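Regression test attached.
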Amino acid sequence: LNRGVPPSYPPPEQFFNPSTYNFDATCLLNSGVVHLTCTGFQKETLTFLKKSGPSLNELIPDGYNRCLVAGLLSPRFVDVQPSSLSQEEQLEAILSAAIQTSSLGLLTGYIRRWITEEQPNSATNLRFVLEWTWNKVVLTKEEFDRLCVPLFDGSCHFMDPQTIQSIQQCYLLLSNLNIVLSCFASEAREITERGLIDLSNKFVVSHLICQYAQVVLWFSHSGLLPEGIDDSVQLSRLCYNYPVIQNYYTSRRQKFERLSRGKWNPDCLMIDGLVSQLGERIEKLWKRDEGGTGKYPPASLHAVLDMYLLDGVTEAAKHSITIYLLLDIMYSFPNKTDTPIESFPTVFAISWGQVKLIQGFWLIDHNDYESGLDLLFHPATAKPLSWQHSKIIQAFMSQGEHRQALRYIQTMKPTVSSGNDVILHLTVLLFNRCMVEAWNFLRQHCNRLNIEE
Amino acid sequence: SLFTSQETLIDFALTSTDIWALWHDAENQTVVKYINFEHNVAGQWNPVFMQPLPEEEIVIRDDQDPREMYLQSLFTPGQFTNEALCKALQIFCRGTERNLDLSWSELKKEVTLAVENELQGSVTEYEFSQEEFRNLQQEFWCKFYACCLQYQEALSHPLALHLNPHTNMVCLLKKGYLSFLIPSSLVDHLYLLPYENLLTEDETTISDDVDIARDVICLIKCLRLIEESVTVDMSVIMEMSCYNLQSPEKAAEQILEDMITIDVENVMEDICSKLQEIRNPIHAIGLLIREMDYETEVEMEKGFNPAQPLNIRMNLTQLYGSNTAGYIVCRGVHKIASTRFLICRDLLILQQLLMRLGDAVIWGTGQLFQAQQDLLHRTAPLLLSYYLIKWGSECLATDVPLDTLESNLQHLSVLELTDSGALMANRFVSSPQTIVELFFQEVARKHIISHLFSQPKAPLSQTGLNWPEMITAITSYLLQLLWPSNPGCLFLECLMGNCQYVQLQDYIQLLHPWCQVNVGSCRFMLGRCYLVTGEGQKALECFCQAASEVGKEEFLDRLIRSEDGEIVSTPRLQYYDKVLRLLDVIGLPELVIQLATSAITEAGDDWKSQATLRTCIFKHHLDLGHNSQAYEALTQIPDSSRQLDCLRQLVVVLCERSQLQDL
Amino acid sequence: AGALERSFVELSGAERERPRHFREFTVCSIGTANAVAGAVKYSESAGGFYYVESGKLFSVTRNRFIHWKTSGDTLELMEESLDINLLNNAIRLKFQNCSVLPGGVYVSETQNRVIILMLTNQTVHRLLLPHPSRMYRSELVVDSQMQSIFTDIGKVDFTDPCNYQLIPAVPGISPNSTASTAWL
Amino acid sequence: ASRNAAYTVDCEDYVHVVEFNPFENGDSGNLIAYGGNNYVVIGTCTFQEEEADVEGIQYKTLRTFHHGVRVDGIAWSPETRLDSLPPVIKFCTSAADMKIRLFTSDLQDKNEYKVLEGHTDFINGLVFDPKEGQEIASVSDDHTCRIWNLEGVQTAHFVLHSPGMSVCWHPEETFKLMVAEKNGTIRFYDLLAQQAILSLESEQVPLMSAHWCLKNTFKVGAVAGNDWLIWDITRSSYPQNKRPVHMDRACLFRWSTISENLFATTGYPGKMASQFQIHHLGHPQPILMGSVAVGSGLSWHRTLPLCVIGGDHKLLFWVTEV
């Protein structure tokens, strides 16, 4: 004894009448048993449409009148006479009642068909659905940005579940429209140069908007939004205390300043490595909001979230900075076990080897040199970039940690990618007094120009 | 008085307590069932899950060669018999009386040359397409394969049952071969039960709590609708994702979009019906993942203890040691793994369906969402573990020569690792083995039977052998000794010792992206692959990676051991000794220079160890003709005997190579 | 056991060896050369036997058994072992001008010999073989490959009137009976 | 007996790999490239078999490029030429850091190259687009063959069933690629369909190196275990000619640049010297046998019956009858 699935929230009142129950039964006979199914009037209607397909154009009004009695049409049709709609209006109502049972596959199936059908009508259907889809992506972002303002206006308005569900529906709709745009991009292979560029720009902008919606949604679920400003009300949540984290990293650059003495970089920070790869795209974003600096940490959570709308920045680099800030947030509240932060690698399907690379890069900036090394040696940890090897070695050198630089070189055996890095590794040996090893490594790099230097 | 169905009874056997019976049904499939008669209150028959024949037609993709796909299946362990393949070959060759006394590695050649001669017999014009060739190739292979299948029917047909009441061993006398019967475990039992039997099982064997037992019985009824709807395309998408080092979570995510865009009669409406008899799916999933794991605290390496009487130990090394027995044990590993892999496939698809429902339909609050992700992070490594154990139970060991084995053993004694001289005793074998069969026969059986008789619950002159307990425990401890996290390294050491230096690279490569134990030992043994494949510069880099984890892994911390307990030098210098001796014993001068230069960074003032090390480095540089490298390897010697005696090699070798200018 | 074993699985002994060499011996049943070649095909069938000491942890019959198959004029026999491989185990016995009886093969253990009792549509037979605890002399085997009880069978006289007998036409076999039983 | 080298050249480092330029584009035909522990060297070799006023050999260095890693493999582009002002030297290398280095040089005092990244462990084989010069194919231990454009983007890939050991591009049917795998399989792939075409077997594991005969495209040649192996694609999936060659296993194979019946093969680096042989399909034996201290790589001169092998601080060269 079951129902069928409700095709809308709220459901149409017809949905709840007992004519929509599905159930199975056994009949006892004078000789044996027999089984049967009572497929309720929704499944009796859907398995009628499935059988009526070969003459559907004669049967559109019969299908419409069945869906208008089974609770498969939207409640807005219940006042409406079937003899005061067109067959096209009755067909959009039936197609709605054949997507509200499922998702996507009819639309992608119609795109793949109309490309393989020649017809000038079907070429106009493809154009119409592409223009309908792109205006849908625009309107869904206009409504999403209109929904999400109370997260970032400093109002502290805890959202109603209907607003959360509206943001979830806009995210789901953006994702559906992204899959319709990729299904245009995979199959419409003869769209000319500027049309292919025009479609590609729409897919990439839709994809970046979908990521922005996904991360704004997760920051709302994990209790980090709305961005509530510090005033004293005792509730169990986390908050983004930019003042504490800014006083940490501005004091941390001042550790390097006062130890390096102008022989090493004051910006040895691993986070002033990760952000430095992304340069003017982020260095200017983190100056939009009042109290922005262009350096880490950011002056708002919105300045972390518009990072996902960035063209010219890869997802792994976006998530690397977001995990760095989540570790600073956990380290701001070490009197707790607020677990839903720890879902972030799984929710964005980030590898354990990327997570451990970020953890080791964070530990070195938080002044651990043991767990900050041996998590970088732990065997899934993603093979570092040459500038990351030389950042780590320069970070031990600008602090004073002779052996932790050497332990890293003796393990990672890193790619000596320029004469600056030869000078760094020679210093690696000579500060630990590795004098024979320095003389042989010197001879390996004493080429017919730089030998005297 | 116990009734059959309408099934046609071929034969039956009888115990003091039970009947075991054998039929052909109606359509002529082989059926075996049993029934206890002193304690069975309901008269229900217990099933036996039979071994099928191979599939009637093979799916071959347009990125695949049809000869590869048919030459895999025809030679895959336990699909076909040599007795079927040779009959198909004799008749496909349309031949006279060839007595084809052939091995697997001979038989593949006469089989493929028969298909190539018949295919060459079909190309009648001088110009043709690559499309017409692939069609003719696929026809001439199917035309051979269906002949092998008809001779595997005519040898799988059943002729009697056989039972031993002194051991409770049960066998099925099929027409060519013999078959053996083994107990199912509770998970693989509940998953293989045809649906009406899963409506008439007893809840009170799964848990003391019937409500947990019920939620598990309903979870299995969701998973079996995924078995009863996932296609060959979708099963290939999962195994292709796992081979190509990809995310099985995303293979399940795509298969779930393909299923949700295909559903023909509302299968997903009944998955969502059965999933609403469940109250706590997170606990029921956590239980099925637990009864599918094999990570354990067990010190299994403790082989037949020196205080045990010699006659007892020799009777125990001889227990379950036949060719037939090792094959039955490792096909036990195979059918457990190749079932639990499908349970994990469907469990990822069902976890992704639950992620796709969440707070919107049945339950709520993201504590469920996290605790379900915390389970998904075990389902994927558990799937990959059973995939790697499937692969190891199908992947063939190489026909390695004795010359190529006794040389490898003389290159491994250089590490002091091995009392393994017993490897010489048994290599009179008439068949190829899988890498798991080779591991069972020459390593794991020697440990498993030490463990099982270490603390015997009765005197060994009064213990009988009970087959249902013995086979289940032996296969269970072989699964623990094949578990991807097992800290003993014994599987990898068996491949290295038996020169299996291709399969050992592919296994380490299927392991590294996700498993996080033994990886120093794996980079060391991958260095041993690269040495024995001539890639010695990659080998040095792999030994230079593995050097980081010395003082962390039992195989690395085993490798550095000595009877000379004068422990002064670092564990990394003791490891660099064991690798220098190897580069010296192979004679690779670059790698001795680069490794000695690397080792000097970690090398102390360890005067005894430095005197032995520099004496080795000196000699073998002098043997290699690197005379100025040998000269400083001699100057750095602190032992006032060795520094006089080493130069007595140097002066001779320089005189009698006529290198008189150096001198 | 500690559980209740509610189901079992079949595994095939589909060995990847060279085809097991069935040593064929022609049982030239003296007198059957007067038979009319309107031969009764029966069905085929198989069977097996276990040693009375096969379950014991220190037995020279531990994990060993005997099995057989029958078709036409022919009986096939093996000894098998889970513990140590059995050289010369495979044999085939072939009864001139006869058909074998399906299930017409029975095995008796004794403290000195294994004894195999076999029936055809015209002749009964007694084969005798050594017991393993008369071949071997020790609770220690050291040999990584053993000989079967069947190894030495090429020394048996299959025409000896103490071993073979022509079945008397009175009382005579009930026409097309497969069923029998044989014992010591 | 061994034959001693005909010609020898000494280096500022060890040699690990050496390849001649196969292309006839604008006086480049006598170029040679070789790799060491931190660098790649480009030079020319002229011989008394090509210029009549040369006594033996003229070797000449043109440029060295230093990149702080070992060089493990080299491939030339067809764009390479000396006739242009400036000249164009264009090639790529593989290295221990599992990355491809694309070099383009006007023979100025430069150290300029482009890096391509995305193979996950070492890279055994490289070949360019043999005709237009605009792509590179690469095989690796990571069970992949990967195609890459000059812009550094991976443009296509094929997954393999064991480490990819050799790769060859077809010079006329430039949509066809050959790959050989350590499992003993040799496969052909289509770059426009992105599919497999056919495969061949070695009967032997490991397969260490394979090569396509660019003087008769029906001939494949390889080494696996202790054999050399040769196929004709018009006949059978198995080696139409198989022979044991080296005792201590066999490592490299190269067909002759000039003759579809002439080829060379190396053994492993056995204890003092790598052994090598030159084989001819008309003969029951090698026609030349040689021996090199730490002997490394294998290549053929573009126009001569002359082969080159690297080793302990040296290049060494041999001439053969045909």
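Expected vs. actual: identical. Chains D and C do not touch (no CB pair under 8 Å).
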